[PDB]
């Protein structure tokens, strides 16, 4: 009966791409980098790996460092939109996020970041998982173009959240986008209601 919406964290609530570039440039000032406008493909480390040998490992070292996830800044409008979305009648919102492989800091900092921007009671809405296809819901708003896993037919409709790395992608017709949190997310939710 309640519409269930899963909202991604990196690239949707938290500005992973800008935080990464800033810290990469500060730590490795003598290395070439990729301006956000020139980002292509989901995996940051793969594109850095193509720009020069050893750069993929240096890029990885930035998000594996302590405080990287905790210090990410929210995207404009994200905190306000998700707070409003969660307060809507017949609407349950969960933050569904995938941790990186090195787990020393990332899970902990993601819970701390949600507590900081949404409060202690919102911690109950977090789902950490590498596989989002096994989480059931009506909608998944996520900036990754291809979301796959153990369930071949996920129950949610994936709405692609725009990001520097996917903004030029042409999607297969059925597929929809949410361009930013300033875009009309309520209309998307309502199109899925009974």
Site residues (CB under 5 A) for Mg ion?
8, 10-11, 143
Residue 42 marked as a ligand binder = yes
Contact partner, 112, from Mg ion, a copy of itself, none, Cβ < 5-8 Å per class: a copy of itself
Cβ neighbours for 108, distance < 8 A, ≥ 6 positions apart: none
- Give which of 9, 5, 20 is closest to 107, Cα–Cα: 9
The yes or no reply on residue 116 touching a copy of itself (CB under 8 A) is no
Cβ neighbours for 121, distance < 8 A, ≥ 6 positions apart: none
Q: How far apart are CA 9 and CA 127, in angstroms?
A: 10
Contact partner, 19, from a copy of itself, Mg ion, none, Cβ < 5-8 Å per class: none
138 assigned to active site:
no
Nearer Cβ to a copy of itself (17/142): 142
* Residues pairing with 141 in the sheet: 7, 159
Residue 113 marked as a ligand binder = no
Contact partner, 2, from a copy of itself, Mg ion, none, Cβ < 5-8 Å per class: a copy of itself
- Give which of 184, 153, 159 is closest to 174, Cα–Cα: 159
Catalytic choice (10, 142, 183, 184): 10
Nearer Cβ to Mg ion (10/109): 10
Considering the complex, what minimum distance in angstroms separates the CB of residue 85 from a copy of itself? 14
Breaks after residues in the chain, judged by C–N over 2.5 Å? none
Residue 30 marked as a ligand binder = no
Cβ neighbours for 168, distance < 8 A, ≥ 6 positions apart: 40
Nearer Cβ to a copy of itself (32/120): 120
The Cβ of residue 155 has, within 10 Å, a number of other Cβ atoms equal to 13
Q: How far apart are CA 69 and CA 88, in angstroms?
A: 28
The yes or no reply on residue 137 touching a copy of itself (CB under 8 A) is yes
* Residues pairing with 178 in the sheet: 161
Where is the binding site, in residues?
Answer: 8, 10, 16, 42-44, 63, 97, 132, 143
Which residues here bind a copy of itself, judged by CB under 8 A?
Answer: 1-2, 4, 92, 94, 99, 101, 103-104, 107-108, 111-112, 115, 120, 123-131, 134-137, 150-152, 155
Where is the binding site for Mg(2+), in residues?
Answer: 8, 10, 143
């Amino acid at each position: 009966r309640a519409l269930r919406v899963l909202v991604d964290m990196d690239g949707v609530l938290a500005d992973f791409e800008g935080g990464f570039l800033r810290k990469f440039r500060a730590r490795f000032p003598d290395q070439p980098f990729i301006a956000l406008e020139d980002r292509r493909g989901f995996w940051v480390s793969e594109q850095y790996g193509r720009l020069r040998p050893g750069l993929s490992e240096k890029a990885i070292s930035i998000w594996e460092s302590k405080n990287f996830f905790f210090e990410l800044e929210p995207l404009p409008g994200a905190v306000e939109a998700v707070k409003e979305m969660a307060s809507l009648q017949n609407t349950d919102v969960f933050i569904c996020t995938s941790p990186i492989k090195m787990f020393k800091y990332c899970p902990y900092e993601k819970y701390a970041w949600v507590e900081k921007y949404f409060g202690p009671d919102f911690l109950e809405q977090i789902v950490l998982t590498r596989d989002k296809t096994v989480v059931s819901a009506d909608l998944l708003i996520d900036d990754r173009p291809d979301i796959t896993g153990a369930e071949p037919t996920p129950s949610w409709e994936h709405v692609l959240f725009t990001a520097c790395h996917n903004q030029h992608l042409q999607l297969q017709p059925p597929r929809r986008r949410l361009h930013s949190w300033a875009d009309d997310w309520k209309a998307i939710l309502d199109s899925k209601r009974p």
